[PDB]
Scaffold this motif. Sequence first.
Motif, PDB file in Angstrom:
ATOM      1  N   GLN C   5      38.832  34.409  41.827  1.00  0.00           N
ATOM      2  CA  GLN C   5      40.206  34.247  42.274  1.00  0.00           C
ATOM      3  C   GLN C   5      41.216  34.504  41.184  1.00  0.00           C
ATOM      4  OE1 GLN C   5      41.648  33.304  45.541  1.00  0.00           O
ATOM      5  NE2 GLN C   5      43.267  34.308  44.328  1.00  0.00           N
ATOM      6  N   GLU C   6      41.970  35.564  41.354  1.00  0.00           N
ATOM      7  CA  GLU C   6      42.988  35.950  40.409  1.00  0.00           C
ATOM      8  C   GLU C   6      44.270  35.170  40.631  1.00  0.00           C
ATOM      9  OE1 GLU C   6      41.512  37.775  42.565  1.00  0.00           O
ATOM     10  OE2 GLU C   6      40.458  39.307  41.554  1.00  0.00           O
ATOM     11  N   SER C   7      44.983  34.902  39.559  1.00  0.00           N
ATOM     12  CA  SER C   7      46.265  34.236  39.647  1.00  0.00           C
ATOM     13  C   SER C   7      47.168  34.617  38.500  1.00  0.00           C
ATOM     14  CB  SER C   7      46.075  32.737  39.664  1.00  0.00           C
ATOM     15  OG  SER C   7      45.520  32.281  38.462  1.00  0.00           O
ATOM     16  N   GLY C   8      48.469  34.412  38.656  1.00  0.00           N
ATOM     17  CA  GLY C   8      49.355  34.771  37.553  1.00  0.00           C
ATOM     18  C   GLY C   8      50.004  36.142  37.720  1.00  0.00           C
ATOM     19  N   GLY C   9      50.067  36.642  38.941  1.00  0.00           N
ATOM     20  CA  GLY C   9      50.701  37.931  39.175  1.00  0.00           C
ATOM     21  C   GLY C   9      52.187  37.693  39.398  1.00  0.00           C
ATOM     22  N   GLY C  10      52.889  38.640  40.024  1.00  0.00           N
ATOM     23  CA  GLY C  10      54.333  38.496  40.203  1.00  0.00           C
ATOM     24  C   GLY C  10      55.104  39.683  39.644  1.00  0.00           C
ATOM     25  N   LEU C  11      56.435  39.592  39.706  1.00  0.00           N
ATOM     26  CA  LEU C  11      57.331  40.628  39.211  1.00  0.00           C
ATOM     27  C   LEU C  11      57.797  40.345  37.816  1.00  0.00           C
ATOM     28  CD1 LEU C  11      59.295  43.145  39.539  1.00  0.00           C
ATOM     29  CD2 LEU C  11      60.931  41.528  40.533  1.00  0.00           C
ATOM     30  N   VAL C  12      57.504  41.253  36.919  1.00  0.00           N
ATOM     31  CA  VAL C  12      57.895  41.076  35.550  1.00  0.00           C
ATOM     32  C   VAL C  12      58.760  42.207  35.047  1.00  0.00           C
ATOM     33  CG1 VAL C  12      55.609  41.864  35.013  1.00  0.00           C
ATOM     34  CG2 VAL C  12      56.947  40.894  33.222  1.00  0.00           C
ATOM     35  N   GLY C  16      58.447  43.397  29.601  1.00  0.00           N
ATOM     36  CA  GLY C  16      58.023  42.022  29.501  1.00  0.00           C
ATOM     37  C   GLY C  16      56.525  41.885  29.572  1.00  0.00           C
ATOM     38  N   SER C  17      56.070  40.662  29.777  1.00  0.00           N
ATOM     39  CA  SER C  17      54.650  40.417  29.782  1.00  0.00           C
ATOM     40  C   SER C  17      54.235  39.441  30.846  1.00  0.00           C
ATOM     41  CB  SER C  17      54.246  39.864  28.438  1.00  0.00           C
ATOM     42  OG  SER C  17      54.850  38.619  28.210  1.00  0.00           O
ATOM     43  N   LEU C  18      52.972  39.532  31.202  1.00  0.00           N
ATOM     44  CA  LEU C  18      52.369  38.700  32.219  1.00  0.00           C
ATOM     45  C   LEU C  18      50.927  38.325  31.887  1.00  0.00           C
ATOM     46  CD1 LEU C  18      52.996  39.278  35.942  1.00  0.00           C
ATOM     47  CD2 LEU C  18      50.647  39.485  35.116  1.00  0.00           C
ATOM     48  N   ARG C  19      50.563  37.064  32.065  1.00  0.00           N
ATOM     49  CA  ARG C  19      49.183  36.671  31.805  1.00  0.00           C
ATOM     50  C   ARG C  19      48.438  36.438  33.085  1.00  0.00           C
ATOM     51  NH1 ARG C  19      46.143  35.308  27.643  1.00  0.00           N
ATOM     52  NH2 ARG C  19      44.517  33.716  27.885  1.00  0.00           N
ATOM     53  N   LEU C  20      47.513  37.322  33.375  1.00  0.00           N
ATOM     54  CA  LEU C  20      46.763  37.276  34.602  1.00  0.00           C
ATOM     55  C   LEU C  20      45.402  36.654  34.352  1.00  0.00           C
ATOM     56  CD1 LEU C  20      46.603  38.301  37.548  1.00  0.00           C
ATOM     57  CD2 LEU C  20      45.685  40.358  36.632  1.00  0.00           C
ATOM     58  N   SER C  21      45.046  35.629  35.102  1.00  0.00           N
ATOM     59  CA  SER C  21      43.752  34.982  34.888  1.00  0.00           C
ATOM     60  C   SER C  21      42.901  35.105  36.140  1.00  0.00           C
ATOM     61  CB  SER C  21      43.931  33.520  34.501  1.00  0.00           C
ATOM     62  OG  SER C  21      44.467  32.769  35.550  1.00  0.00           O
ATOM     63  N   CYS C  22      41.568  34.966  35.991  1.00  0.00           N
ATOM     64  CA  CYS C  22      40.579  34.984  37.060  1.00  0.00           C
ATOM     65  C   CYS C  22      39.630  33.809  36.967  1.00  0.00           C
ATOM     66  CB  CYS C  22      39.791  36.292  37.032  1.00  0.00           C
ATOM     67  SG  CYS C  22      38.455  36.442  38.246  1.00  0.00           S
ATOM     68  N   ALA C  23      39.706  32.970  37.969  1.00  0.00           N
ATOM     69  CA  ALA C  23      38.854  31.820  38.021  1.00  0.00           C
ATOM     70  C   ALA C  23      37.582  32.212  38.715  1.00  0.00           C
ATOM     71  CB  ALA C  23      39.541  30.687  38.746  1.00  0.00           C
ATOM     72  N   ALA C  24      36.475  32.097  38.021  1.00  0.00           N
ATOM     73  CA  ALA C  24      35.215  32.475  38.597  1.00  0.00           C
ATOM     74  C   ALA C  24      34.407  31.260  38.955  1.00  0.00           C
ATOM     75  CB  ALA C  24      34.450  33.316  37.626  1.00  0.00           C
ATOM     76  N   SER C  25      33.616  31.382  39.996  1.00  0.00           N
ATOM     77  CA  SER C  25      32.705  30.323  40.356  1.00  0.00           C
ATOM     78  C   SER C  25      31.488  30.860  41.087  1.00  0.00           C
ATOM     79  CB  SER C  25      33.417  29.265  41.165  1.00  0.00           C
ATOM     80  OG  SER C  25      33.823  29.763  42.381  1.00  0.00           O
ATOM     81  N   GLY C  26      30.490  29.999  41.250  1.00  0.00           N
ATOM     82  CA  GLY C  26      29.256  30.345  41.939  1.00  0.00           C
ATOM     83  C   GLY C  26      28.222  30.950  41.001  1.00  0.00           C
ATOM     84  N   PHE C  27      28.611  32.006  40.322  1.00  0.00           N
ATOM     85  CA  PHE C  27      27.717  32.685  39.404  1.00  0.00           C
ATOM     86  C   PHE C  27      27.815  32.172  37.980  1.00  0.00           C
ATOM     87  CE2 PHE C  27      30.694  35.379  37.341  1.00  0.00           C
ATOM     88  CZ  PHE C  27      31.694  35.418  38.191  1.00  0.00           C
ATOM     89  N   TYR C 117      31.520  42.167  44.490  1.00  0.00           N
ATOM     90  CA  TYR C 117      31.779  41.101  43.539  1.00  0.00           C
ATOM     91  C   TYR C 117      33.116  41.297  42.886  1.00  0.00           C
ATOM     92  CZ  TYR C 117      26.920  41.033  44.288  1.00  0.00           C
ATOM     93  OH  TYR C 117      25.688  41.055  44.854  1.00  0.00           O
ATOM     94  N   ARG C 118      34.126  41.228  43.718  1.00  0.00           N
ATOM     95  CA  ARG C 118      35.498  41.428  43.322  1.00  0.00           C
ATOM     96  C   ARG C 118      36.373  40.409  44.021  1.00  0.00           C
ATOM     97  NH1 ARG C 118      36.614  46.982  44.707  1.00  0.00           N
ATOM     98  NH2 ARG C 118      37.349  46.140  46.703  1.00  0.00           N
ATOM     99  N   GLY C 119      37.437  39.994  43.370  1.00  0.00           N
ATOM    100  CA  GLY C 119      38.348  39.045  43.985  1.00  0.00           C
ATOM    101  C   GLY C 119      39.358  39.735  44.888  1.00  0.00           C
ATOM    102  N   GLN C 120      40.342  38.977  45.360  1.00  0.00           N
ATOM    103  CA  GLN C 120      41.351  39.543  46.244  1.00  0.00           C
ATOM    104  C   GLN C 120      42.419  40.248  45.441  1.00  0.00           C
ATOM    105  OE1 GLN C 120      41.349  39.333  49.913  1.00  0.00           O
ATOM    106  NE2 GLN C 120      39.243  38.969  49.210  1.00  0.00           N
ATOM    107  N   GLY C 121      42.612  39.789  44.224  1.00  0.00           N
ATOM    108  CA  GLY C 121      43.565  40.384  43.323  1.00  0.00           C
ATOM    109  C   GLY C 121      44.951  39.835  43.480  1.00  0.00           C
ATOM    110  N   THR C 122      45.801  40.177  42.532  1.00  0.00           N
ATOM    111  CA  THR C 122      47.184  39.761  42.589  1.00  0.00           C
ATOM    112  C   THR C 122      48.057  40.954  42.471  1.00  0.00           C
ATOM    113  OG1 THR C 122      47.461  39.702  40.239  1.00  0.00           O
ATOM    114  CG2 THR C 122      46.812  37.672  41.275  1.00  0.00           C
ATOM    115  N   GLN C 123      49.180  40.928  43.139  1.00  0.00           N
ATOM    116  CA  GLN C 123      50.079  42.040  42.974  1.00  0.00           C
ATOM    117  C   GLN C 123      50.942  41.808  41.770  1.00  0.00           C
ATOM    118  OE1 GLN C 123      50.692  45.132  45.126  1.00  0.00           O
ATOM    119  NE2 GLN C 123      51.647  45.595  43.167  1.00  0.00           N
ATOM    120  N   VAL C 124      50.937  42.779  40.890  1.00  0.00           N
ATOM    121  CA  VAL C 124      51.765  42.762  39.721  1.00  0.00           C
ATOM    122  C   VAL C 124      52.763  43.867  39.882  1.00  0.00           C
ATOM    123  CG1 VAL C 124      51.823  43.012  37.225  1.00  0.00           C
ATOM    124  CG2 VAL C 124      49.927  41.811  38.337  1.00  0.00           C
TER     125      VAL C 124
END
Lengths: 196, 338, 126, 57, 285
Positions: C5-12, C16-27, C117-124
């Motif tokens: 699960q990706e998070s931290g997207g948005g309009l920048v 500027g800068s943006l920090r995009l993170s991916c929370a992994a689980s299960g594996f 094995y890919r998340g939904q992603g975030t729009q940046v």
Amino acid sequence: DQRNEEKAQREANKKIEKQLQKDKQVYRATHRLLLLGIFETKFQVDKVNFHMFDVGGQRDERRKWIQCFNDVTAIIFVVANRLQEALNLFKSIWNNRWLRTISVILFLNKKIEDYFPEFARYTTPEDATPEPGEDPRVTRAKYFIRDEFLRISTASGDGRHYCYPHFTVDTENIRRVFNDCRDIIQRMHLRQYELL
Amino acid sequence: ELDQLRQEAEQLKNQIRDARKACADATLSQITNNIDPVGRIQMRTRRTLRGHLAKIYAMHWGTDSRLLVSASQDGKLIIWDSYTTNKVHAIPLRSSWVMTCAYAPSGNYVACGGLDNICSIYNLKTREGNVRVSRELAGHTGYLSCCRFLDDNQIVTSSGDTTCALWDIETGQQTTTFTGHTGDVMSLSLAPDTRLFVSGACDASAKLWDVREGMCRQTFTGHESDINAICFFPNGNAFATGSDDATCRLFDLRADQELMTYSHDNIICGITSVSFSKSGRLLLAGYDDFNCNVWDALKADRAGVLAGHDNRVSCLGVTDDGMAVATGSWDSFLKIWN
Amino acid sequence: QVQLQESGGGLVQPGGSLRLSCAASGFTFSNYKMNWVRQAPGKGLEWVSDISQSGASISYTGSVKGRFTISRDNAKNTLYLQMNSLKPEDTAVYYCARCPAPFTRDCFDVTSTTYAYRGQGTQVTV
Amino acid sequence: TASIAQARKLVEQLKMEANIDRIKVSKAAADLMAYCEAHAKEDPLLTPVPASENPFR
Amino acid sequence: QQWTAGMGLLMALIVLLIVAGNVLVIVAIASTPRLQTLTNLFIMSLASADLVVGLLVVPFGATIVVWGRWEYGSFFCELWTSVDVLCVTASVWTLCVIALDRYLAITSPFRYQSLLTRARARGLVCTVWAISALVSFLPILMHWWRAESDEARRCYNDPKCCDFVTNRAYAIASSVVSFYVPLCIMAFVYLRVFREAQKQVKKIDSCERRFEQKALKTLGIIMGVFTLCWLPFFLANVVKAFHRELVPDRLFVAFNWLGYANSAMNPIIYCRSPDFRKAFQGLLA
Ligand SMILES: CC(C)NC[C@H](O)c1ccc(O)c(O)c1
């Protein structure tokens, strides 16, 4: 009784083994090439049989079907943004556990700095075969791209497999495949005999 | 619209995860601890079947536990007499890129397939003695990873286009397409009753399908990597799934959950093929480790190891009478162990 | 079940800068090589970056070298992509993607349109 | 909007699976266990048999 | 004195090294399907010939080395000489054939697999043994292998002497067919194989240098050990035929033992490739 059944089965076995032994001289003699970028293409160069597999029927995913090409003499890899994809595919093949013994014959067909900024600092590395009249910026680009693929190929494999880059006339291209296969085969044997 | 719908999907997934938790009572790892272990089961190769010129991808025993078919990339399907080692047939393929095969339980037909996206079914029993293709079950949009016969006129195939299909062999058509999954479908195992089957895929999930309808009855998850192989526990209520993460997992259809992991700290090799012994007590799994572990299905003890291969072990299966285990490999040999 | 699960997207704001993170689980995240995948609107899926299982070697799309950087914190099962000096050209959905098998070097089908094995992603956006 | 239709299919599939008469895993474990014990006496790979019985001797 | 005991122990070591080495090679090839190929047909034959040196030649040569008397009938040194020439010749011609197998594999990489069919490989390995038989059993047992001199004739006629007393024509004909021809062929082959290895290295280097020695070391060992072990002996055979009273009997023999030692070395020269190393650990574990 069953003794006749056994006799008959042994005879059937012999007929089969003899046919497989005949087939064996075709199977080992005909080289297999995988083409990336099933449609079997058969060809012969200087009386050497080869067949190439254009595996264009398997969608985007490659994880499981390229895995079945473990006995391939060579993978023919055809290139031309899209370059990074080609490099990444090349790299994953190069480093694949089952394709780690297979050489790659690479055909480089057809703003680079926006995809590869390091290109801007690139110098054609002395050894080049430009066509007379060829634009030096193209020459520079061609060797840059060639080198990025080689950077991958020289990174690992410990001599098990080699990359044979070429630029791109089907006659000349198939001639190159033959010659590259010749080098691939000699290198395999030289390593088997611990002479390379 | 999409966000509301994806959120609903997540809520449903969580309700299911909790429904599974609700049933997470003591499992085999707690229950079977007081059961005598199978011990160290050694098996020796009793027979070596030589003749393939290329890697062997698949095999299937017929119901007589004597005739064994194996498929390899040299363009042949070889039907072996597993007791005598004599070849019975050496059937040419239309294309050598064969990944699977099946033997009709009846011995009348043999099936195979691979990168043609065609399941090729041959008449083994014919008046001419010439084994020929009876039907080309064309219509997949990707390679055939696995096929298994239900009857002489019915076959289920799995393919690279993420679907499975039930084919009417005589008419040459899919009658049921079992859609779902995201990645390639890698493996089939038919339940003993051929009403159900289970299908493994490169989604790190397996689905229980009702073969009579294009319906997934249950989705089993717990894997972290692609599934390469599935076999049913011989009562039809459970199955074992092999995967690239080196953990074979036992799932139970009524429990709708994973019951047990078969893994070891020293195995980082994937599982390429799985099978059960007739009692369901021994779970066998072939690996990229060039061997096959014989797991105690109830305890996950490793017990013995079959390790006669130099190359990848694939093509694993067990006879219907429980008498023998056959494995193939990328070394082009089959070995029958017991 | 595998989940990314990706998070931290948005309009920048450009530059500027943006920090995009991916929370992994299960594996078991620590056994896998991880990547980032980018879908610019109107385009297919581009590979952006590749970080090794141990967080050692890192590879990047040449187009982002020195502008985007990655890291992974195995203890948190989290993958990160730090995007600096963003350009309008970097508008995309960014996806977290895992290399198919644990303990490997190859990453087949990362950027495949149906890769599992890919998340939904975030729009940046920029 | 293909992705909505795809998500919808997933949602319908999940609803169908949510509605399952799941049993306690302890029951399931007991039954797989019982099967194995019931057939333990028959299965040759668990209980090797004499050469006179084993066709592969 | 204790020196006799010393030689007995040293002799036990060489027969054990030759036999153990060649038994592992034959057993590994026969037991491991992975090794049952065309190249290893020749290697199994080499091991067979070398095993014969280890089982039928060396333990008999040993009696002369340890106490100095051929305590058998004169027939037995007629046969022993025949066996020794046979298996030495077969070993050397098998080495010649292995070089030819490698020659083709490198020289004509697209035809090797179709040119050297199993039927031809069998004919070729059998030819090595046939060549060997006709330059050993035939001239030795039909006694074309007469001693040339009168003293040399006194010996051999003497059942306890049984030295290597040849006629002059034989020593050259024999040394050439069993050894100098194989040196010429192996040298021909390896010069060309080495040159092809050099070409491949240069072609690799033209790329890799921006991101000879292995072939030389390995061929150095192959031709080096073969030539070193057998050449001193075959040069001496020519001498015994011509200007016989030049090489001391103890030197001629020492060279022959050096030559027999080639059979101790061959199991670690033409083998020990990754597949033999694995097969041996399999057998040993
Ligand atoms: C019989 C003893 C002294 N060994 C003879 C030597 O091994 C030999 C081998 C092959 C020949 O062709 C030869 O002339 C001599």
